Each structure stands twice: as structure tokens, then as C-alpha cells.
Scaffold this active site. Sequence first.
Site, mmCIF file in Angstrom:
data_model
loop_
_atom_site.group_PDB
_atom_site.id
_atom_site.type_symbol
_atom_site.label_atom_id
_atom_site.label_comp_id
_atom_site.label_asym_id
_atom_site.label_seq_id
_atom_site.Cartn_x
_atom_site.Cartn_y
_atom_site.Cartn_z
ATOM 1 N N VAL A 89 0.567 -1.229 -0.025
ATOM 2 C CA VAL A 89 0.006 -0.131 0.010
ATOM 3 C C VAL A 89 0.806 1.153 -0.063
ATOM 4 O O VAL A 89 0.323 2.203 -0.358
ATOM 5 C CB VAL A 89 -1.056 -0.087 1.232
ATOM 6 C CG1 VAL A 89 -1.959 -1.043 0.844
ATOM 7 C CG2 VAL A 89 -0.452 -0.031 2.681
ATOM 8 N N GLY A 90 2.095 1.237 0.544
ATOM 9 C CA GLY A 90 2.821 2.400 0.338
ATOM 10 C C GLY A 90 4.425 1.876 0.220
ATOM 11 O O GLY A 90 4.925 0.821 0.626
ATOM 12 N N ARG A 91 5.051 2.964 -0.561
ATOM 13 C CA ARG A 91 6.615 2.812 -0.859
ATOM 14 C C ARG A 91 7.244 4.116 -0.793
ATOM 15 O O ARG A 91 6.690 4.991 -1.293
ATOM 16 C CB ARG A 91 6.856 2.266 -2.334
ATOM 17 C CG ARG A 91 8.258 2.096 -2.707
ATOM 18 C CD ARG A 91 8.979 1.053 -1.948
ATOM 19 N NE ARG A 91 10.421 1.138 -2.282
ATOM 20 C CZ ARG A 91 11.390 1.795 -1.473
ATOM 21 N NH1 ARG A 91 11.072 2.209 -0.384
ATOM 22 N NH2 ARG A 91 12.778 1.566 -1.877
ATOM 23 N N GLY A 132 9.882 3.298 3.725
ATOM 24 C CA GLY A 132 10.209 1.836 3.229
ATOM 25 C C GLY A 132 8.913 1.232 2.609
ATOM 26 O O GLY A 132 8.558 1.873 1.825
ATOM 27 N N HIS A 133 8.561 -0.097 2.911
ATOM 28 C CA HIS A 133 7.416 -0.699 2.533
ATOM 29 C C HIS A 133 6.348 -1.149 3.143
ATOM 30 O O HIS A 133 6.787 -1.797 4.351
ATOM 31 C CB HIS A 133 8.237 -1.956 1.638
ATOM 32 C CG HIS A 133 9.322 -1.860 1.044
ATOM 33 N ND1 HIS A 133 9.376 -1.660 -0.433
ATOM 34 C CD2 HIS A 133 10.771 -1.784 1.230
ATOM 35 C CE1 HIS A 133 10.543 -1.837 -0.922
ATOM 36 N NE2 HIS A 133 11.393 -1.648 -0.042
ATOM 37 N N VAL A 134 5.322 -0.689 3.091
ATOM 38 C CA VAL A 134 3.964 -0.872 3.883
ATOM 39 C C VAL A 134 3.113 -1.798 3.093
ATOM 40 O O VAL A 134 2.773 -1.325 2.062
ATOM 41 C CB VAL A 134 3.584 0.486 4.431
ATOM 42 C CG1 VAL A 134 2.374 0.209 5.198
ATOM 43 C CG2 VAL A 134 4.489 1.157 5.369
ATOM 44 N N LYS A 185 5.273 -2.782 8.225
ATOM 45 C CA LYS A 185 6.266 -2.109 7.483
ATOM 46 C C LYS A 185 7.641 -2.658 7.503
ATOM 47 O O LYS A 185 8.014 -3.120 8.467
ATOM 48 C CB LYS A 185 6.356 -0.744 8.335
ATOM 49 C CG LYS A 185 7.484 0.236 7.762
ATOM 50 C CD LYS A 185 7.386 1.548 8.063
ATOM 51 C CE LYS A 185 8.161 2.062 9.369
ATOM 52 N NZ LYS A 185 7.664 3.375 9.841
ATOM 53 N N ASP A 215 7.837 16.210 11.465
ATOM 54 C CA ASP A 215 7.690 16.087 9.865
ATOM 55 C C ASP A 215 6.125 15.883 9.680
ATOM 56 O O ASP A 215 5.566 14.914 8.806
ATOM 57 C CB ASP A 215 8.158 14.702 9.282
ATOM 58 C CG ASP A 215 8.085 14.625 7.723
ATOM 59 O OD1 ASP A 215 7.964 15.769 7.151
ATOM 60 O OD2 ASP A 215 7.987 13.460 7.193
HETATM 61 C C1 LIG Z 1 2.958 9.742 -3.909
HETATM 62 N N1 LIG Z 1 1.785 10.696 -3.492
HETATM 63 C C2 LIG Z 1 0.648 9.763 -4.405
HETATM 64 C C3 LIG Z 1 1.501 10.431 -2.237
HETATM 65 C C4 LIG Z 1 1.346 8.985 -1.695
HETATM 66 C C5 LIG Z 1 1.162 9.047 -0.168
HETATM 67 C C6 LIG Z 1 -0.147 9.050 0.314
HETATM 68 C C7 LIG Z 1 -0.120 8.370 1.501
HETATM 69 C C8 LIG Z 1 1.153 7.584 1.591
HETATM 70 O O1 LIG Z 1 1.861 7.716 0.361
HETATM 71 C C9 LIG Z 1 2.071 8.499 2.430
HETATM 72 C C10 LIG Z 1 2.562 7.838 3.596
HETATM 73 C C11 LIG Z 1 2.414 6.520 4.116
HETATM 74 C C12 LIG Z 1 1.136 5.866 3.570
HETATM 75 C C13 LIG Z 1 -0.204 6.511 4.277
HETATM 76 C C14 LIG Z 1 0.884 4.390 3.606
HETATM 77 C C15 LIG Z 1 0.734 3.763 5.096
HETATM 78 C C16 LIG Z 1 1.646 3.898 5.848
HETATM 79 C C17 LIG Z 1 1.736 3.437 7.095
HETATM 80 C C18 LIG Z 1 0.577 2.821 7.847
HETATM 81 C C19 LIG Z 1 0.186 2.252 8.751
HETATM 82 C C20 LIG Z 1 -0.662 1.784 9.196
HETATM 83 N N2 LIG Z 1 -1.729 1.688 8.352
HETATM 84 C C21 LIG Z 1 -1.514 2.392 7.161
HETATM 85 C C22 LIG Z 1 -0.695 2.866 6.638
HETATM 86 C C23 LIG Z 1 -0.310 3.398 5.433
HETATM 87 C C24 LIG Z 1 -0.236 4.212 2.802
HETATM 88 C C25 LIG Z 1 -0.251 5.241 1.693
HETATM 89 C C26 LIG Z 1 1.120 6.200 2.080
HETATM 90 C C27 LIG Z 1 2.584 9.599 1.848
HETATM 91 C C28 LIG Z 1 2.043 9.991 0.504
HETATM 92 C C29 LIG Z 1 2.616 11.391 -0.116
HETATM 93 O O2 LIG Z 1 3.723 11.690 0.580
HETATM 94 C C30 LIG Z 1 2.776 11.311 -1.550
HETATM 95 O O3 LIG Z 1 2.734 12.375 -1.996
#
Ligand SMILES: CN(C)[C@H]1C[C@@]23CC[C@@]4(O2)C(=CC[C@]2(C)[C@@H](c5ccc6ccncc6c5)CC[C@H]24)C=C3[C@@H](O)[C@@H]1O
Lengths: 339, 266
Positions: A30-32, A36-38, A55, A148
Site C-alpha cells: 500500500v505504501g513505498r 520503506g515498504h508498507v 512495514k 515531519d
Molecule cells: C505519492 N503520492 C501519491 C502521495 C502518496 C502517499 C499518500 C499516503 C502515503 O503515500 C504516504 C505515507 C504513508 C502511507 C499513508 C501508507 C501507510 C503507511 C503506514 C501505515 C500504517 C498503518 N496503516 C496504514 C498505513 C499506510 C499508505 C499510503 C502512504 C505519503 C504519501 C504522499 O507523501 C505522496 O505525495
Amino acid sequence: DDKMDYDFKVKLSSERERVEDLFEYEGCKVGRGTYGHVYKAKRKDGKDDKDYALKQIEGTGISMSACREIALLRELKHPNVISLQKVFLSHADRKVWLLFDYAEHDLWHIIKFHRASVQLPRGMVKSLLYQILDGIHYLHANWVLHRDLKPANILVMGEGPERGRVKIADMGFARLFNSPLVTFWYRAPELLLGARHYTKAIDIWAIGCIFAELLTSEPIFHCRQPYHHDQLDRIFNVMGFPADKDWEDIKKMPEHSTLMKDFRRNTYTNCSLIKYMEKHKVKPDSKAFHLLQKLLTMDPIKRITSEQAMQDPYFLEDPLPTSDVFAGCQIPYPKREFL
Amino acid sequence: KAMAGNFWQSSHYLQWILDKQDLLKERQKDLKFLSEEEYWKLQIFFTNVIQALGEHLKLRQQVIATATVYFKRFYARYSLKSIDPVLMAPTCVFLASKVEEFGVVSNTRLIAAATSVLKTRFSYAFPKEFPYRMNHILECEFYLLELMDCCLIVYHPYRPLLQYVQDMGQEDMLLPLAWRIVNDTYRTDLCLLYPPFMIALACLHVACVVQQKDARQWFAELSVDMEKILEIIRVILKLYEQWKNFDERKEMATILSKMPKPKPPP
Ligand SMILES: CN(C)[C@H]1C[C@@]23CC[C@@]4(O2)C(=CC[C@]2(C)[C@@H](c5ccc6ccncc6c5)CC[C@H]24)C=C3[C@@H](O)[C@@H]1O
């Protein structure tokens, strides 16, 4: 190791819970990012049916960021701060995995959904702000800075036991000597002027930015791609140029003489937070606005603290904040897309 | 500093204040090879090793103290044979320095310090040079972190000691000595058995007795369990008799050869 005890080693290897036996997460990323990698994960033994976030920290081994993130999360316990459930140390590849409860939503995605149009409901905005403030107060009381803060680090729980609860995530782990020396939209003027340490007040600035972004659906200090001229220009186009009396120690900032070289007061003469917020249909006599203005104070020593902001009469005016940010209403925001 | 007022909800308090009887039962494994006496001598010795590694690296006392605690936590659960304490000691300093916000100490510098300290300051105990490379430190670090259940924030007596002497208004008179006595308590089990502020209070009591400072009244006005404070005082007092009667330099080679040995693979 050849001089480590075989019996001890094989005993531990046998008992060691490995992430890949415990969790199904293949292709569920769901995230990179720099974190790291989530992944969204499920337990392979069907004991519980909850969603977890896994993560994998950037890098290998125990780096400063990794070491300190583990150290702090292991101690911190508050409803508005993401809880570390478990730590997996993968010995073969030297990767560290962290386990959390899965937050279906976050403010980057929520705000961007509203900006795709319906402005954010006023009840929900106040509740978001209250829970962000609650979480930050807890961190700050324990002398822990986030460093941050931004919408993407404000998670919000989806359907389940913690419906609509903020979880602050990914604290600025870490910064050498507690020192800052591509997003600049949430950074306090003093950082942009070459401030040499993070402070509680810097976090508070980011919270004001977020609050403004919730009320309007626009980032208040949006700007193009330490000292960044255009980012400062944008702050002054919103806030006006600070008078000597508004920020007396501005002269002490390392980049102050650069600011004088590049900028003139008179450029920003008909510019103020009042006039910005009126263009986005938020009333300057509202308690919302007056709270926002105290959060977005230029001189860090004149910014209110998290605790004072929680005491603000904004939170006593109808509607009251709620534990569920969505207030029992249906959640219209889409679920996370996989990568 | 991070988590300062949170001792009562901390992992230190909730997981790493141990029952003394549990401690000694786990210690029986190693007591088949070493006497009680020789076991406490090893503990003193490795306490001094960690101190020396720390001074050489120019780390603050708190980093050294956190490192010392990690070493004690590990050998509270596990046998001396499980991982070579010669490897664990510089691993504990290394990990502590990353927690305590000093830096990732250079690999070549960590390895150089261990090599140099054993050679120059501990040649009475070690004929051969420090034989481990960094990849061994890195391996050991994973095992250390797993055993401590990722509990890295440790609380020490220095902070409350300082508050107590400020309160007394005797920072000049007593702080040097009390601080030194706090350092000495790391030669014992006290940090595994008592909250830090209690060790602080005992060290300060002893400093006052050593300097003939009447603090009866100040101590009487504390709302604290004075029996536990006296228990700590006794352990401090016995530690100084142990120290008097111990020649580390003549005894440690022999004691180190009695340690149980890590079994090789088949
Ligand atoms: C690249 N852009 C599209 C944005 C992408 C985005 C949105 C949410 C996120 O990716 C994130 C940070 C961490 C997120 C929220 C991830 C994440 C990270 C940690 C989590 C912990 C528990 N549950 C859910 C979690 C989800 C999922 C999408 C990621 C930050 C961004 C923006 O900086 C970009 O501009």
C-alpha cells in the site's frame, strides 16, 4: 558465528517467529517511500480476521532511524499515536519488519478526495484537529518531537473497533544532533530561516497548516518544486511580512540578512491571514479562525502549545469533537489501492 | 530527553525490574562452573570493560550505563556460554550509542576500540588480540535486540540524583561523590532489581555518611519505602568490601578460563 553456542542458536532459530510464516502480504503493498515498504497483511493462522500494517524499514540492519523508531514506539502508548504491536528481525537478509493495526484512511487521501470536488464537514474537521492535538501533546509531554507533520502522516482508522480515530504515524526518525542542517509546505518560517534544531513550536506550525488545509481543502502554503525563497514568498503572500514587533528575535536567525537582501515589507502590504481565509469562505470572527491564527504565529515563542490549543473555546462551541471523526455517518472515502 | 517522566508506564519498569529469586534461579546454570564469588567478579570485570570501551569512544556516562544494562539483561536470562561476553560487550556499546543519539560509531572505530582497550588496559585477562570482525558485532546485535524484546530506553539514577542534590542545595558538596557511587552500583545487580530513583537515594545517603553530612531530616521528609533504601545501602556497602578483597588483575584470567564455553557445531 563459530564461537556462539550451537544449542542456544538452534533453539532460537526453531522458536523464531518469521514474518513470512505469520503473515500473508504478497502483492498487498500500500505504501513505498523513504519509510520503506508498507503492506496490508492478514494472519496465516486464522485466529483473528483483523487487518494489519506491515512495514519493512528502508535499508538493512539497525540504522539510527530504525533503532530510534523501535526504541520510542516500544514505549509510547496513546490512542492517537500508532501502536507498535510486534517487531520481526529477519536474520538472513538483515531486514526489520514492524507490525501495526491497519488504518484504512489518512488525511492526504481524505483531503484530496474533497479537493476532487463537498468541502470537509465542520464537525469532522474539529474532531481531526482535536485528536491531532491530543496525540502531539502526548508526544511533546514525553519530550518526543514528530519533526515531519503533514496530512500523509495523519492516519485515520476505518471500520472496526477504532472507527474514525486519528493515528499519528511515521515520526521524523531520525535527525543527527536533533538538526535539520521535496515538500516544504508544512515547515515553519524559522526552519526556512536556518533554525538549527527542531522544537515543539515547529510541530505546532505544521498542525496549523493541516487545520487550514482541512477548512479549505487547499494547502495554505502550496508552492512549486534550508533557505527556500519561494516558500517564504508564499508564507508572506498569505500571512503578510512580520513587523519587528511581531518577531523580535528574527534578527538572530542565520539567514536573516539573506531575507533582507531578497525581500521588501511593502510587497506584502495588503496581505494577511484574515484576507486569505475570507477568500476561502471561513469567517475571521469565528473561533476556528482565532485558533488557526494562534497556531500560525510567525515567531515560534508566540505560537501556542498543544495543551493551550486543546483548551481553546473552539472545542466547547457546538458541535463538540467526537472519538469517531466520521460521527457515526457512512465513510465515502475509497479504500487503499494496492501497487 | 525522550520519555523522562514515563518510568511508571515504561518497558524498563514493566518488564526489566526483575524478581531477585527468579534472577538467581536462572543463574544456577552458570554456577555449576563458577562459584557465586567468581560470578560477581566476572560481572565487575565486564562492567569495567564496558566502561573502558566507552571512555575510549568518548561516550557520555549515560550511554555507557545503558550499554551496561543491556549486557546485564542478556546474561540475566542467558548463560555466559551462549554468546562470548567479549563480543557482547562492544555490541552493547554499539547499540546503546545508536539509541542515545550520539551516532552510528564507525565500524573501523568500534573494532579499533575493542582491539585497543583489551590490548592496553586488559592484557592481564586476554593474551590474544580481540578476534571479532564487524559482521560478528552485527550478528550479535540482532540476538541482543531479540532477547531484550526491543526494550531500548533505559532509565538511570543520574537524573534523579541531580534533582535530589539540587533540592538539598548541596550540588558542590555531594554530587561528585554520589555520582561516583552511582557509577559503582553498576558493578552489582541493583539496576535489575530497583527503580533508579531508589538507587540514587541510596548512593546519596552513602555520600552524606562518607562526608559526615547530616541529612536525616531531608531523608525523613521523603515519602519513600526506607527499608528498600536500606537494602540498597547494604549492597553498596558490601560492594566496597568485595572491591577491597578482590584483585581483579591477579584473578581474572583464571576466572575467565572457568567460564563455560560456547559449544561448536557438529
Ligand atoms: C505519492 N503520492 C501519491 C502521495 C502518496 C502517499 C499518500 C499516503 C502515503 O503515500 C504516504 C505515507 C504513508 C502511507 C499513508 C501508507 C501507510 C503507511 C503506514 C501505515 C500504517 C498503518 N496503516 C496504514 C498505513 C499506510 C499508505 C499510503 C502512504 C505519503 C504519501 C504522499 O507523501 C505522496 O505525495
